[PDB]
Design a protein around this motif. Structure first.
Motif, PDB file in Angstrom:
ATOM      1  N   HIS A   1      22.317  58.468  40.162  1.00  0.00           N
ATOM      2  CA  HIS A   1      23.016  58.667  41.423  1.00  0.00           C
ATOM      3  C   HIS A   1      24.523  58.468  41.319  1.00  0.00           C
ATOM      4  O   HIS A   1      25.198  58.441  42.350  1.00  0.00           O
ATOM      5  CB  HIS A   1      22.457  57.715  42.486  1.00  0.00           C
TER       6      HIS A   1
ATOM      7  N   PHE B   1      15.761  58.684  48.604  1.00  0.00           N
ATOM      8  CA  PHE B   1      16.575  58.557  49.801  1.00  0.00           C
ATOM      9  C   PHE B   1      17.979  58.080  49.447  1.00  0.00           C
ATOM     10  O   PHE B   1      18.209  57.462  48.405  1.00  0.00           O
ATOM     11  CB  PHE B   1      15.939  57.575  50.789  1.00  0.00           C
TER      12      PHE B   1
ATOM     13  N   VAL C   1      17.647  54.156  52.749  1.00  0.00           N
ATOM     14  CA  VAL C   1      17.106  52.877  52.299  1.00  0.00           C
ATOM     15  C   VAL C   1      17.247  51.829  53.394  1.00  0.00           C
ATOM     16  O   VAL C   1      16.321  51.050  53.653  1.00  0.00           O
ATOM     17  CB  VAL C   1      17.800  52.432  50.997  1.00  0.00           C
ATOM     18  N   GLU C   2      18.408  51.787  54.050  1.00  0.00           N
ATOM     19  CA  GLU C   2      18.604  50.824  55.131  1.00  0.00           C
ATOM     20  C   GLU C   2      17.668  51.109  56.300  1.00  0.00           C
ATOM     21  O   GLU C   2      17.131  50.180  56.915  1.00  0.00           O
ATOM     22  CB  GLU C   2      20.061  50.843  55.589  1.00  0.00           C
TER      23      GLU C   2
ATOM     24  N   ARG D   1      14.692  52.523  56.113  1.00  0.00           N
ATOM     25  CA  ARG D   1      13.364  52.089  55.698  1.00  0.00           C
ATOM     26  C   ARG D   1      13.242  50.574  55.763  1.00  0.00           C
ATOM     27  O   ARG D   1      12.205  50.046  56.180  1.00  0.00           O
ATOM     28  CB  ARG D   1      13.067  52.594  54.286  1.00  0.00           C
TER      29      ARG D   1
ATOM     30  N   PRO E   1      23.216  50.078  48.539  1.00  0.00           N
ATOM     31  CA  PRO E   1      21.823  50.118  48.086  1.00  0.00           C
ATOM     32  C   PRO E   1      21.370  51.524  47.725  1.00  0.00           C
ATOM     33  O   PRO E   1      21.715  52.510  48.380  1.00  0.00           O
ATOM     34  CB  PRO E   1      21.059  49.595  49.308  1.00  0.00           C
ATOM     35  N   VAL E   2      20.578  51.608  46.659  1.00  0.00           N
ATOM     36  CA  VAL E   2      20.029  52.872  46.185  1.00  0.00           C
ATOM     37  C   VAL E   2      18.557  52.672  45.857  1.00  0.00           C
ATOM     38  O   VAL E   2      18.130  51.577  45.477  1.00  0.00           O
ATOM     39  CB  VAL E   2      20.795  53.401  44.952  1.00  0.00           C
ATOM     40  N   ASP E   3      17.781  53.742  46.006  1.00  0.00           N
ATOM     41  CA  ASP E   3      16.362  53.736  45.685  1.00  0.00           C
ATOM     42  C   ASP E   3      16.097  54.713  44.549  1.00  0.00           C
ATOM     43  O   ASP E   3      16.631  55.826  44.534  1.00  0.00           O
ATOM     44  CB  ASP E   3      15.508  54.101  46.905  1.00  0.00           C
TER      45      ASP E   3
END
Ligand SMILES: Nc1ccn([C@H]2C[C@H](O)[C@@H](COP(=O)(O)OP(=O)(O)OP(=O)(O)O)O2)c(=O)n1
Ligand SMILES: [Ca+2]
Lengths: 958, 411, 399
Positions: free
Chosen positions: C126, B36, B41-42, B44, C61-63
């Motif tokens: 990313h 994602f 992410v935010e 989720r 933020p990254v996943d």
DNA sequence: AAAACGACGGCCAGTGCCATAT
DNA sequence: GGTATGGCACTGGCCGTCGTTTT
């Protein structure tokens, strides 16, 4: 007996000898010529006389020569102590009120000169009691005053003279007014609207039967000199089109008018501050003396009116059965468990969830519709063109890496604070969203509302915009509202009107395929369009409100009422509205029921020994506030319980009655009369002519009725008219109650198609006549019209005369329909009284530990213990038999068919429901009642089964 | 058909990540997508926080639990699930040969046995802690354990692995009331799933049974292609609990009223990734006004949207506008409000394009400052739901926003 | 040490007394944490996120997945996922091959995927796509918290929760940025420390010669590393995208340069253990910082009617929970335990305050309040409690 | 620096439909 | 036929007061 003339099966062999005895009877008048001739001309001599199996049981011993004397004996033995106690109130006189009112805890007795002495309990076998409650705090009674034959009494609550941070909100017996007299014992309490006061008594909630009984002045006023629902409005308004002699013999509503009528004298002053309803508790804490002195007036007036009343009641109903039934009929008792709180919470939650879903569905529509402001696009819409699209102008008064840099953030926030400091240039009273449109402004709660919510939370159904936002259409034409004609629809034809948009909408709907309907009024001046009123279930030229009425749900399913061009899910909205309406109406009343949770220490040991006894469970009771004889016809009245509404698959709150569950180790045993409202009329008509059941057509149809062939009155009428059996009741009870040709006309206009038009005046001839006194259905007129026009109209069975407001001397012509219906309704009332007295006698004699529970709408329920359930059923069954016998005896008939000799079935259940074989599923609990709360299915029995399980013996030991 | 546009927006605004080929219905449903974007992410995180606060925090008997992502130790040979191996020993293997004909092909049996597997569900880890968690409530039978975590599922290298994040609750009850609790939880869960949904009628439930005759219920969401499972409930009972601790069964006993009994295990498991996908699909447009109003916007619930407020700058003295914007940014962040710093980007973007981009990103409010803010402090505020721009004083903004969110949460 | 016993007894560390050990805790093969330890780790992660990501607009933020399939580079110490299904289907019909054992080992290590070693590779995956999020403005970063798998010397496997920030910055100001970040991190680690002098930092160089810094905590036995800062140049970024470089350029003052990578990686499990050791000091109490204590206040009842005090305590519990205060519902069963044992139990669990409610609360609304740091007793009106608590917590956050 | 005032806000009550009950 | 009851939307009329203007 096995048979009788007309070949109708009669009571069994031994039973008739046990009750009646084959003596002192004539075989009719030795002539059946008239009956046979009438049954022949009508062509109703069918013979589906299939015998029903007979059983023989040794009945309980009776007293006196005949059944009437037995009933009188038991009624006297039941009503002697309470009449004796009331005589004491009649005889005695009491000193004046004390100079001052005491300030203590509990009960104080006032001496001859005001010397107040604290007492544990009034300790008298008589009382006139009034109770006051501080509504703001809750339901705990605040103070009370009682009139005794020899002294005055005052009760002051613990919550009133002591100050605490908080009090328990779960009521307990230790927070009520005590009147306990442990171990003459048969105590009597009198009051005005005495059900309310009875609800606030400590020991009234004990499971074991309480020997104390209660008496109400309003019940007696209604019985003696009451007013019909029609009479009351005229009586109040004037304070009848040819006679007004009744105007000065009846009172209304408040105790003040009752005292004015019965006694008269100084008018009763009403407190203008009504502190007990409006003011808070601290206001009462200081106005104690004035409020208590005000309350004493009520008890004094009640005593005076009771003094002037009791002899009249004792004279009008000389039959003690009436008094015994009145005493027993106001002692209802409804058990409840902690499942009651869960039911309340779940019902409220489901109501809120469904209402929020609907409201959000409209909020999204409003948000989407708010966007056509740009470019004046709303003006082209065929719906939202007619609102106010205005805006009010806002107005007021005339690279590199950083170092520590702790200074930068502090200086930035200091600048922010300095800018904040500019509040002095803003008006004190804020504006309300000037940037939104006016129609959106109306729906937005003010910024200062304590319960403000985001978006337009004021939107709901039945508003002038909700069907406008939905873009509803009728037969392909958009809706339109006018100030004076109500809702309707707009048809294209020949501030700027969007003619082109409407015509294009019609053309877009026509591809998939002069209108006629409500008159095309030309007063609503829209040059390019025509306004048609939306048809109502009533006649034309009447305004109509929200099209979301339940009437249109089937019509919408036809495919004419749509929301497609602008939205969808109209049927869903109607579904929620239908599901919600009942709870929306009744939530305040249902949630306000006074529930007293009995602590473990005082439960009967039988309810804690059971394996089902939940330790966390709360086992309380609710005492219905039924005003016995609250209507001219002497029927109990309470808007909450005494109603013919039960669980439905679609209604959220319809599971109300299912929450009355027996405590662990106890059971409910109940019954329901097989169309008593018709049996009364049938037997009256039969006994009018000859002395054998089934004299004429109607008695023959109601007797030995058959649901299979449909020969029963309900099914026969349904197939004659073509409507459903369940909906046939209105078609019959209206006719039976003399609703008349205008009723049979307008109902036939309204109910469905092909019965309107001239048929409404030509179809009732089939139902009411054939080729003024006689002719087919008219044979009833020649009996009731004779008993309701006597100098002293009276019930043919027991013997109370109609209220003084409806005497022939008082009223001569008016209130004729109510006069005739009073006979049958009072007959049902006497049936109920006879039932109650009979089962009390049987329970006392055979040591059954059950007690009366409630009698809703001609039903009867009882709370018994498990170990005796079968006995109760047997008792209940036998009771009905004797009651029917009494009727047959009192009308001159010495026989009884076995068809009506017993109930269809007696229900043994763990809760209260219309029928055991149904599961109460509602939107509030789609899960089955047997699975959501864990309660068995239950069953119903018939005479033979109870006979076999009980071995034909009612004594405890077999 | 109409989901092509939705996936295009989700890709453009960094809700997902990858390419038009990697992102597809099958890949998203299975769980083998690249991942994602930050907005995803935010989203989720917001969904997980809402689930946690609506399931765990407001209950006085529910406790958290952490379960390792792998199962070590010997295993039964029939599962055939993936296995974990350290190749610091496989490199030692490559130095010689030994019994390389048939027996070291039966060595695959050892490979099956002495190799751990990746965690497949959180139920096993929760059950592994049933005994030790009885000391938290003094052995009161009705009590639960909740977790949120990733689990691995093989999918059709011939076969690959897909990772899915889901939340599981294991609820120990007395045997008698098991079904009762089941019903309750079902209701509650359904309500929760319908709380944020713009069209709650698209969520549904249905009963079911297993080959062993145990009750169960399933929850489905109506995607445009059909109904897809998103949460399942099971009344396991006693099978696994007894099979895990044979012998001295008395240590499994717990108090129900006055009776010490073996609890019935009830399981609830809802997949968070598919829930986020369902919420994304729900919030899209997909009714003539719909044909005339082409505004594409993801009407995500305020409690779930990743970005709350957007902040920008009008033309003027850049120094003072930057100062006030920094102050407002710090003030808004200090109170739990997420902000999008659009004032850093140059003015190459017009107001219409900015509004379109922010609507596509599902931002509740857009706030604009100008020299007028310096002079009197009245800023512009545009609302996502209504697209109407009001003037309003700065000193109240924070408060207002807070109230809004709370006044939307507590409904 | 007694601290491990206290942690095990009060449900900070899961497992049995046999399993728990220092080496297992350090490596990451311990059975797992208890609910209190889980909540403490959650609070620590929330504080780290608040301090690092939210207040800075250059951090997103990254996943990243816990593994990656496809062809692999031989010569790594990570966990390779061997296919049990293939070998079981072969077991059904075992072939009688002779030489193909080593060949099959080569094949399995050539094709089969492997678990996650660190969050740096996923973050770098990313870089190109997240560059679009800032219009190619070179200085920025990506942050993530996730679990990592490591080998433990039948090689075992250990789990470690780590928070990682990867910062892309022009080479001109790389070193300065490094130092900047270092300082912040150190201060953050010292923000909640009862003895900040026990947190230290050092300098280090890569084998190539790249500069970096390490953060250490002085445990009772010896110093242990908890976080590392590395300046990695641009080798990894170029290797990940071989050949053309026009898709990796970043704008810095209208000058296109390839960014240098700064890796900040701190492990949360060892940090949590360090904080547990720090808070531990004749009483046995864990003076956990108010912003990190998993449970704030303990609520109980005294002597009086059960049904009234239970309702009062339930209402107080709801009011405290609605405001973000974590409470321990000790009133659900009268412990029948002397206040000494109750106080000791709540002290071992690091509970800031203890609230006692009795019928006197019904009388006038006064509740008993006991503190953890100052072991003092106070009487306070019930309605004030909430506000007081909030203020206190806020003060602890601002000081 | 005082004391009046006008174009617009809460608020009670009357009017008018609809569901429940029968 | 011939009413009453509780709920709720709409609407004129009342008093209020805050910015607004004289003195
Ligand atoms: N428009 C109506 C509808 C009903 N009733 C009343 C008269 C009856 O006394 C009462 C209850 O009738 P049921 O529906 O309970 O009918 P039975 O008394 O015949 O019972 P069952 O339903 O078993 O036939 O309805 C009335 O007066 N006017
Ligand atoms: Ca009936």
């Amino acid at each position: 007996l096995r048979h009788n003339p007309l070949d109708i099966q009669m009571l069994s062999r031994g039973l008739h000898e046990q009750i009646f005895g084959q003596g002192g009877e004539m075989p009719g008048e030795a002539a059946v010529r008239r009956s046979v001739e009438h049954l022949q001309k009508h062509g109703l001599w069918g013979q589906p006389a299939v015998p029903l199996p007979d059983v023989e049981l040794r009945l309980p011993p009776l007293y006196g020569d005949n059944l009437d004397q037995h009933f009188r004996l038991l009624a006297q033995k039941q009503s002697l102590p309470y009449l004796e106690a009331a005589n004491l109130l009649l005889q005695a006189q009491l000193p004046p009120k004390p100079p001052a009112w005491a300030w203590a805890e509990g009960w104080t007795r006032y001496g001859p000169e005001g010397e107040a002495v604290p007492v544990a309990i009034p300790e008298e076998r008589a009382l006139v009691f009034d109770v006051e409650v501080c509504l703001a705090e809750g339901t705990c009674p605040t103070l009370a005053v009682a009139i005794s034959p020899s002294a005055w009494y005052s009760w002051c609550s613990q919550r009133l003279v002591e100050e605490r941070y908080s009090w328990t909100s779960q009521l307990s017996p230790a927070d009520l007014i005590p009147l306990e007299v442990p171990t003459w014992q048969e105590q009597l309490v009198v009051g005005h609207n005495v059900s309310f006061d009875r609800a606030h008594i400590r020991e009234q909630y004990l499971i074991q039967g309480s020997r104390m009984r209660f008496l109400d002045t309003m019940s007696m006023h209604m019985a003696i000199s009451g007013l019909s629902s029609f009479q009351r409005s005229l009586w109040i308004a004037a304070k009848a089109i040819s006679s007004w002699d009744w105007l000065d013999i009846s009172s209304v509503n408040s105790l003040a008018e009752v005292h004015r009528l019965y006694v008269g004298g100084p008018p009763l002053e009403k407190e203008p501050r009504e502190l007990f309803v409006k003011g808070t508790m601290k206001d009462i804490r200081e106005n104690f003396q004035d409020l208590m002195q005000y309350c004493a007036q009520d008890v004094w007036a009640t005593h005076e009116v009771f003094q002037q009343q009791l002899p009249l009641f004792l004279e009008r109903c000389p039959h003690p059965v009436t008094l015994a039934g009145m005493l027993e009929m106001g002692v209802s008792y409804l058990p409840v468990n902690q499942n009651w709180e869960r039911y309340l919470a779940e019902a409220q939650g489901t109501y809120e969830e469904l209402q929020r879903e609907m409201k959000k569905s409209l909020m999204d529509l409003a948000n989407d519709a708010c966007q056509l402001l740009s470019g004046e696009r709303y003006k082209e819409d065929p719906w939202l063109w007619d609102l106010e699209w205005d805006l009010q102008e806002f107005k007021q008064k005339k690279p590199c890496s950083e170092e520590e840099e702790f200074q930068q953030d502090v200086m930035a926030r200091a600048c922010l604070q300095k800018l904040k400091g500019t509040t002095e240039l803003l008006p004190k009273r804020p504006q309300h969203l000037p940037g939104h449109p006016g129609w959106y402004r109306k729906l937005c709660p003010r910024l200062d509302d304590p319960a403000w919510t985001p978006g337009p939370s004021l939107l709901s159904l039945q508003m002038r915009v909700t069907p406008k936002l939905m873009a509803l259409t009728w037969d392909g034409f958009p809706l339109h509202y006018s100030e004076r004609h109500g809702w309707g629809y707009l048809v294209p034809g020949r501030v700027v009107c969007p003619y082109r948009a409407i015509e294009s909408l019609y053309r877009k709907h026509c591809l998939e395929q002069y209108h006629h309907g409500n008159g095309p009024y030309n007063d609503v001046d829209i040059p390019g369009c025509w306004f048609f009123k939306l048809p109502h279930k009533d006649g034309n030229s009447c305004n109509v409100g929200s099209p979301f009425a339940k009437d249109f749900l089937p019509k919408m399913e036809d495919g004419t009422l749509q929301a497609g061009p602008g939205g969808a899910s109209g049927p869903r909205a109607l579904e929620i509205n239908k599901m919600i309406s009942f709870w929306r109406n009744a939530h305040k009343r249902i949630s306000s029921q006074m529930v007293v949770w009995l602590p473990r220490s005082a439960l009967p040991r039988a309810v804690i020994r059971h394996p089902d006894y939940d330790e966390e469970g709360l086992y309380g009771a609710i005492l219905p506030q039924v005003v016995t004889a609250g209507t001219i016809t002497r029927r109990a009245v309470e808007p909450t319980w005494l109603t013919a509404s039960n669980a439905r698959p679609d209604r959220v709150g319809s599971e109300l009655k299912a929450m009355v569950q027996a405590p662990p180790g106890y059971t409910l045993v109940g019954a329901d009369v097989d169309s008593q409202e018709l049996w009364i009329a049938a037997v009256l008509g039969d006994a009018h002519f000859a002395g054998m059941h089934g004299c004429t057509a109607f008695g023959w149809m109601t007797l030995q009725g058959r649901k299979s062939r449909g020969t029963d009155l309900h099914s026969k009428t349904a197939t004659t008219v073509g409507i459903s059996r369940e909906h046939a009741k209105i078609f019959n009870y209206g006719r039976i109650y003399g609703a008349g040709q205008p009723f049979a006309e307008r109902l036939l206009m309204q109910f469905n198609h092909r019965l309107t038009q001239q048929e409404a005046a030509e179809k009732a001839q089939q139902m009411y006549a054939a080729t003024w006194k006689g002719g087919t259905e008219s044979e009833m007129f020649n009996k009731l019209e004779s008993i309701a026009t006597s100098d002293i109209p009276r019930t043919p069975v027991l013997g109370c005369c109609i209220s003084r407001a409806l005497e022939p001397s008082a009223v001569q012509e008016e209130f004729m329909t109510s006069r005739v219906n009073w006979v049958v309704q009072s007959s049902a009332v006497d049936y109920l009284h006879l039932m109650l007295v009979a089962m009390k006698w049987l329970f006392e004699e055979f040591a059954i530990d059950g007690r009366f529970c409630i009698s809703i709408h001609d039903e009867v329920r009882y709370l018994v213990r498990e170990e005796d359930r079968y006995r109760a059923a047997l008792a209940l069954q036998i009771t009905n038999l004797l009651t029917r016998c009494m009727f047959a005896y009192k009308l001159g008939l010495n026989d009884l068919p076995q068809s009506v000799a017993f109930f269809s079935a007696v229900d043994i259940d763990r809760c209260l429901r219309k029928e055991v074989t149904m599961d109460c599923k509602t939107p509030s609990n789609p899960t089955g009642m047997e699975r959501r709360y864990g309660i068995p299915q239950g069953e119903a029995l018939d005479i033979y089964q109870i006979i076999e399980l009980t071995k034909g013996s009612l004594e405890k030991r077999s | 058909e109409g989901s092509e546009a939705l996936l295009e927006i989700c890709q453009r605004r960094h809700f997902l990540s990858g390419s038009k080929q990697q992102l597809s219905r099958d890949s998203l449903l299975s769980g083998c997508h690249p991942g994602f974007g930050p907005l995803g992410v935010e989203l989720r995180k917001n969904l997980a926080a809402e689930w946690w606060t609506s399931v765990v925090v407001f209950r006085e008997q529910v406790f958290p639990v952490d379960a390792l992502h792998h199962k070590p130790g010997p295993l039964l040979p029939g599962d055939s699930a993936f296995r974990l191996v350290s190749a610091e020993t496989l490199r030692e293997i490559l130095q010689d040969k030994e019994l390389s004909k048939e027996q070291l092909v039966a060595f695959l049996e050892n490979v099956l046995k002495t190799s751990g597997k990746l965690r497949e569900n959180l139920l096993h880890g929760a059950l592994e802690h049933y005994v030790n968690c009885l000391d938290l409530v003094n052995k009161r039978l009705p009590y639960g354990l909740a977790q949120i975590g990733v689990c691995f599922h093989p999918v059709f290298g011939v076969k690959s692995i897909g990772e899915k994040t889901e939340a599981s609750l294991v609820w120990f009850t007395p045997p008698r009331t098991s079904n009762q609790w089941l019903d309750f939880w079902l209701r509650h869960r359904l309500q929760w799933w319908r709380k944020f949904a713009m069209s709650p009628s698209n969520f549904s439930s249905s009963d079911c049974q297993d080959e062993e005759g145990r009750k169960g219920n399933k929850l489905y969401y109506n995607f445009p292609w059909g109904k897809e499972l998103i949460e399942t409930l099971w009344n396991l009972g006693d099978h696994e609990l007894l099979h895990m601790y044979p012998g001295n069964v008395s240590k499994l006993h717990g108090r129900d009223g006055r009776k010490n009994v073996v609890p019935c295990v009830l399981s609830v498991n809802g997949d968070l990734d598919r829930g986020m996908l369902a919420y994304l699909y729900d919030s899209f447009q997909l009714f003539t006004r719909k044909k005339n109003l082409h505004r594409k916007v993801l009407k995500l619930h305020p409690c779930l949207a990743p970005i709350k407020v957007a902040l920008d700058v009008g033309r003027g003295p850049t120094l003072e506008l930057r100062q006030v914007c920094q102050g407002l940014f710090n003030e808004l962040l200090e109170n739990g409000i997420s902000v999008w710093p659009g004032y850093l980007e140059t003015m190459q973007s017009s107001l219409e394009q900015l509004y379109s981009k922010y609507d596509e990103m599902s931002i509740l409010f857009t706030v604009l400052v100008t020299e007028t803010t310096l002079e009197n402090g009245l800023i512009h505020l545009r609302s996502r739901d209504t697209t109407m721009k009001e003037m309003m004083h700065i000193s109240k903004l924070k408060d207002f926003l807070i109230k809004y969110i709370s006044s939307a949460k507590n409904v």
